[PDB]
Structures are given as structure tokens and as C-alpha cells.
Structure 1
Amino acid sequence: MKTQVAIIGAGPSGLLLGQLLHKAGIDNVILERQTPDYVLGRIRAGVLEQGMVDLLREAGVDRRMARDGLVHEGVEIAFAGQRRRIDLKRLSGGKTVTVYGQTEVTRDLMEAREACGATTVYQAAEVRLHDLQGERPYVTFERDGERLRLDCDYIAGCDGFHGISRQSIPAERLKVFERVYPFGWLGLLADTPPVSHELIYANHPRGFALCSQRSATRSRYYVQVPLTEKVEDWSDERFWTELKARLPAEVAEKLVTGPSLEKSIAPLRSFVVEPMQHGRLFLAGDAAHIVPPTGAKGLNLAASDVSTLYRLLLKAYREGRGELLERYSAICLRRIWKAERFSWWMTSVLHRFPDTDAFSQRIQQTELEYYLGSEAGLATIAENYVGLPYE
């Protein structure tokens, strides 16, 4: 087969890029290693920034989101003793965030694509990338036990952390920046009404807790755990007691509990690769960078990479301005690094780190007290949380 742009991975990144390109008249084929329900089984993200909200609208996939997503104008931080609200809307100059599940976003994009009849190959096994620096790169994959070749002009690597894209670039061409945190988040998806109309981030001596939601009758809760914990060790009951133990008493008392729909432990990491391209291959989303979940930025960054890639390819195709594609990595990395710093910061102030001396503990408290206390400090949080402008 032959196409314009070949996309590796049928996650939100590949799907959204695919959608935007199709609608713009640029043919693209998506190659996914797994099945459509495997993809749809990932819970992940709950919070979208306005830019991603706008991109979905632009891909013409926002009906359901407009109906079903919840607009939030504030978030709360609870730290030893109190509960503080950050008014996002007023502090960011009128911006908000939207709660809409990653699974939901993914489902909407898969439907839109299916309708349009754009090509998607599920269970594409053994994807391999070839001739990245030539004029004519191609992708090989196996469909059954048949190896097919897809010819294209450009490859978008939208295959997440463990994809093949990043792996296909000469190791010597990339500079890696990684931070591994000594803790993960145990998440619990329950068909219970959320404890608050807004999110609650909690710094507690026993460790971080987060009260999030999916809808009015669907909640998502997380507690920080050591990397050595196995989820088979966390019954629903154990989860509920522990959560309750990390929250403000008035919050724990109002908490409606119930059986889990899903439970999983996610390890926290910081990761950036520079540059994010090679020849005719362009990395986007988790393939190029990972942020700890704390600042609700991963999917939001994939969206900014995708927005940048899409606009650059349009220009190349419709305007014959292929040279601007050289500017892809410079553009995305300005945004990445600022989102990674916010994410690191959020992570360092709300989590309980092992082997922390008295000083470092006290500074942790003071940062909270300072930032939650000053109009300037509050504003720093608010403008980062809502998302910084797209370039």
C-alpha cells in the first residue's frame, strides 16, 4: 500500500493526528499493535486543558465531550491541617480545565475515524521503520504471518513509551533526560459519586491522595504507594481505609465507597528526548516524553505535539513548504520543558519522599504555605494548571 503519512499507534495521539489530517485531505494510515478493545481498556487521563478541548472541536469530534465532560473552575490542595482552593478561572484570566476520560476521548476518535473510512490496521505486529533519511521511507508489519510494506512520505511515531519509533532512531542521535520517582500511584475506578465537585490533591504524612472523577456517578481515586506494592495486595477495603486515612476528616466522612471497576499501579517518571525527529520520522506524545501524572499534562502535551505536527504537515502538503518541518522539535520542546517543570514541582510538593531530612520536610510545607498563600504564587499554579499558550 502507499499513503502520505503513516501513523504508528492508535492511541489518542495517533487517532487525533489521524483525524486532523484526514479532514485536511492528507491520507494517513494508522498501524496499531493491539486490538481496539485493549486500547479502550486503558483508564488513564481525566483532565484536559482548553487547547486539547479546542483541538477535538477542530477534528470535529466534540459532540459527546461538549455534552458529557465537566467544566472545572477550581482545584483544591489539602496539606497538613487545611483545605485550600485555587480559583483557576480567575487566577488564569478566565481559563478552565475539562474532566473527560481518556477512554471516552479515544472511543470518540475511533468512531469518527471508522465513520470516515480512513485506514486503520489493528493487530499490526512486528512494525519496523525503514529508510528514515531517504525521500521514500516505508513501514513493514505483519498481518497474520504476512509481511506487508507501507510506502509513505512521513512517519508519525505515536506509539507511546514503549513504541518502536523512538527505538528506530540512531541512539547516538538522541539525548535522554529521565527522572524515576521512588513511588507509584494506586488508582481506583468506582461507580460511586465523587466526594467533591472539584478535584482534591492531598499531601498527608502517610503519602499523597487524589480525589478525581469521571462523571457525577463515576469516581477516580489514587493513593501514593511504594514501587514494591503489588495491586493483588490492595483489596477494595484496604484502598478505602487508606484513602480515608489521608484526607481531611470532613472529606473522609462524606466519602461514598464501593467496589472497584479497575485498580492499577502506575509508576511515576519524567522523560524527554532531544531532538524529537529523525529524517522523515516525527515523535509525538508519550513516544517522545513522559510526565508524572501529578500536573495532568501527558495527554495534554501529546495534543500540543500533534497540533504542531499537523499544522507543519498541512503547510508542507498544501503550501509546498516542507522546510518548516525542521522546526518541529524546537517548537514542541519549549512547551515540553515548561510542562515537565510544572509536573516535577507539583510532584515534589504533594508527595512523601523516603529519606527526607527535617529541613527538606519543612521547606516542602513552606512551599505549600507560600504558594497557596500569595496571589502571585496562586497565579503560578493556575496558569500552569490550565495550560500555557500553544506556540
Structure 2
Amino acid sequence: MKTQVAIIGAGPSGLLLGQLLHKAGIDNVILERQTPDYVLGRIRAGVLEQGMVDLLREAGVDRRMARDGLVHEGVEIAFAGQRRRIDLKRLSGGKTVTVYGQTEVTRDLMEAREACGATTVYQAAEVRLHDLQGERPYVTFERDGERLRLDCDYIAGCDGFHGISRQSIPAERLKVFERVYPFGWLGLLADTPPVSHELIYANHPRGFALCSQRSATRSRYYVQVPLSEKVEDWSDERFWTELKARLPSEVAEKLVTGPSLEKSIAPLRSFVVEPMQHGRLFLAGDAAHIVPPTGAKGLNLAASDVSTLYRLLLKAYREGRGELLERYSAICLRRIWKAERFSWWMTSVLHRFPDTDAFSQRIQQTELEYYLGSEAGLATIAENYVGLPYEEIE
């Protein structure tokens, strides 16, 4: 079996990269450990930057998003009995963000790939990467008992945090940067109208709460929760009562509750690996970095890694400029670190930390008061929130 670019992982990164590549004439095969249904079961992201929206258009998979996606021009932050609206559009010079679930984006990409007839092998078990520094790397996997080999020119590791690709780079070549937060997010998806037309991030003494949405009749809520929590300990009723206790009274009063369609706990963490490549293997998305959910940057950073990898590969195949691929890590890391800095800042000002001294609590509240009260403070949040510009390369 032979292709030009082998892609490990059929989550959004792999599918998006594969679609862009296919449309430009660069053959690619995607290998995925799970089944289509398992992948489609992950709820995850809801907020997309303008850059990600443009990439989807370039891949030609934007019909449903243009119809069903909700364009947001602002977002609210509630703390100490007050709600402040950050006008993203005004403060960032006209940019906005789009709410369209990750599940939907993934569904759109999968349908698009099937229609073009590109190769995707699900239940590709025990994927192994070989001869990463040779001129002819290859991938081996198992499909129903038999071990098959796929030959390629390049390999893009789009296999998330627990993927095989990052594990295939000699540990000594990698530099790992990681921070584990002492809390997680308990999320609940419900077929109920959202409490507001814009998102509400809330810093409350009991902990963080976030009011989000998927559509006009589907909501997504989150509440900060200790790492010791087990989802079976949170009945729908306990969740709604908790959510209500963390929101401003006028917001909690008009909240329409309902049975959960999905309920799960996601731990918060920051993780960056440098560089993001080795030989003919290039890491993209969660395989190379994790950002806490607070800033809505994860899927958005995956998009920029992908936009960068695709353009460099195009240059390599179309223009014979294979040497430009060495710049991949340098280009992506500049954006990754600024997004990590923002996600980290959001996380530190919106959440309640264990054993915080009086001074730090006061500084936390003052950070909010300053950034939300100053025109310059507001603009730093807004420009970071809509997403810093992609770099052009070369």
C-alpha cells in the first residue's frame, strides 16, 4: 500500500489536513484506531476562531457551518456580583468567533472525505511508525488480524495526546513543558435553549461556571470540580443546583433546565513539546500540545498547525521546495506559546484555586477589575479571544 502523506488520527486535525491535501492533489491516507461512531461521540469544542472558519471554507466544507453556526460578537464575564460584556467585534477591529460544535465539524469533514473517495482506514490497530529519518518512512498497522504496511513520503501525527506519533520520537530529542491544574470541568449537554445569546464565563466563590451553547435549542454548561470527583456522583439535579448557585441571580432565574444528553469530566492541563517534528514525522494538534479549555484555543491551534503543515507540504510537492519543511516547528510554536499564555491567564483569573492566600485572591479580583474596566485591558482580551493572526511563512 502506498501514498504520499500518511495521517495518523481521524479527529478534526487529521480530517482537515487530509481534506486540504486531497483538494490540492496530494494523496493521503488516514489511519484511525477507533470507529467512526466512537469519534463522533466526543462532544468537546464549541468555539471557533475566524481563522478556523476560513480554513473550513478553503477545504470546501463550510455549507452546514454557514447555515447552522452562530456568529458571536461578544462574551460576558461575571464576577463579584456584576456582569461585564466584552465587545469582541468593536475591540478587536471587526473580528468575531463562531459557535459550531466540534462534533458537527468532524461530521462535515467525514462526509466530505467519503464523497471524494479518499482513503480512511478505521480500526487500524497497533499503528507503528518506522524509518522516520530515512528517505522512505513507512507505517504498519493491523486490520482484522493481518499486519499491513503503508509506504509514504511523510507522516503527520494527528493522533491526540495519547497517540503513538509523539511516542515515536526519541525522548532525548524532545523538550516537554507541562502544568497540571488541581481541578477539572464537569460538562453537561442538554436539549434546552441557552440561558443567553452569548457565552457567560463566571468567577464565583464556589468555583468557575460557563454557560455555552450548540444551537438555539441545545446548551452546553460547565462547572469547575475537584479532581477527586466521579461523574456518577453528579446527578442532573445536583448539577443544575450547583450551576445555579454559581451564576448571577437574574441569569439563574431564567435558566431552562433539562435531562443531560452527555455528562463528563475533563481535567485541565497545559502541555507543549519542542520541536514538533522529527525526520519525516510532523506533529499537529493535541499530539503536540494541550491547552486548558478556558481560552477555547485547542481545536483552533490544531487548525493553525494544519494550515501551516498543508502550505509547507504544498510548497514541497508543487514547488520542489522540500527544505521549507524544517521551519514548521518554529512557525507553529510562536502561535502556540501566545495561545498557551492566554489560556493560562484565563484559567488563573476565572477559577478558584485550592489554598490561596488572601493577597492572591485580592490580586485575582483586581486583575478582573482592571482588564474589564480599561479600554486597553479589554482589547488584550478581545484580540486574544478572537485569535491572533496566522503567520504567512517563508
State the TM-score, normalized to the length of structure 1: 1.00
Quote the Cα distance in structure 2 between the aligned partners of 1:125 and 1:374: 54
User: 1:194 Cα deviation (Å)?
Assistant: 0.1
Partner of 2:134, secondary structure, is coil
> Alpha-carbon deviations, 1:271-307, whole Å to 9, x = none?
0000000000000000000000000000000000000
Quote the Cα distance in structure 2 between the aligned partners of 1:182 and 1:217: 33
Quote the Cα distance in structure 1 between the aligned partners of 2:129 and 2:278: 12
Quote the Cα distance in structure 2 between the aligned partners of 1:354 and 1:4: 50
Q: Which runs of at least 4 in structure 1 moved beyond 2 Å after TM superposition? A: none
Partner of 1:223, secondary structure, is strand
Partner of 1:164, secondary structure, is coil
Quote the Cα distance in structure 2 between the aligned partners of 1:33 and 1:289: 20
> Alpha-carbon deviations, 1:210-237, whole Å to 9, x = none?
0000000000000000000000000000
Quote the Cα distance in structure 2 between the aligned partners of 1:51 and 1:322: 25
User: 1:38 Cα deviation (Å)?
Assistant: 0.1
> Alpha-carbon deviations, 1:166-202, whole Å to 9, x = none?
0000000000000000000000000000000000000
Identity %: 99
Quote the Cα distance in structure 2 between the aligned partners of 1:169 and 1:269: 22
> Alpha-carbon deviations, 1:88-140, whole Å to 9, x = none?
00000000000000000000000000000000000000000000000000000
Q: What is the match of residue 286 of structure 2?
A: 286
Q: What is the match of residue 332 of structure 2?
A: 332
Q: What is the match of residue 215 of structure 1?
A: 215
Q: What is the match of residue 37 of structure 1?
A: 37
User: 1:361 Cα deviation (Å)?
Assistant: 0.2
> Alpha-carbon deviations, 1:288-336, whole Å to 9, x = none?
0000000000000000000000000000000000000000000000000
Could you tell me which runs of 5 or more consecutive residues in structure 1 were left unpaired when the two chains were aligned: none
Partner of 1:160, secondary structure, is coil
Quote the Cα distance in structure 2 between the aligned partners of 1:326 and 1:134: 15
Quote the Cα distance in structure 2 between the aligned partners of 1:90 and 1:296: 20
Partner of 1:193, secondary structure, is coil
User: 1:45 Cα deviation (Å)?
Assistant: 0.2
> Alpha-carbon deviations, 1:122-167, whole Å to 9, x = none?
0000000000000000000000110000000000000000000000
User: 1:369 Cα deviation (Å)?
Assistant: 0.1
User: 1:81 Cα deviation (Å)?
Assistant: 1.1
Quote the Cα distance in structure 1 between the aligned partners of 2:166 and 2:373: 42
User: 1:389 Cα deviation (Å)?
Assistant: 0.2
> Alpha-carbon deviations, 1:37-87, whole Å to 9, x = none?
000000000000000000000000000000000000000000011000000
Quote the Cα distance in structure 1 between the aligned partners of 2:289 and 2:379: 26
Q: What is the match of residue 199 of structure 2?
A: 199
Quote the Cα distance in structure 1 between the aligned partners of 2:30 and 2:336: 25
Quote the Cα distance in structure 1 between the aligned partners of 2:235 and 2:324: 53
- 1:130 partnered with 2:130: yes
Quote the Cα distance in structure 1 between the aligned partners of 2:174 and 2:52: 28
Partner of 1:186, secondary structure, is strand
RMSD: 0.5
Number of aligned residue pairs? 391
Partner of 2:129, secondary structure, is strand
- 1:24 partnered with 2:24: yes
Quote the Cα distance in structure 2 between the aligned partners of 1:81 and 1:53: 35
Quote the Cα distance in structure 1 between the aligned partners of 2:37 and 2:96: 31
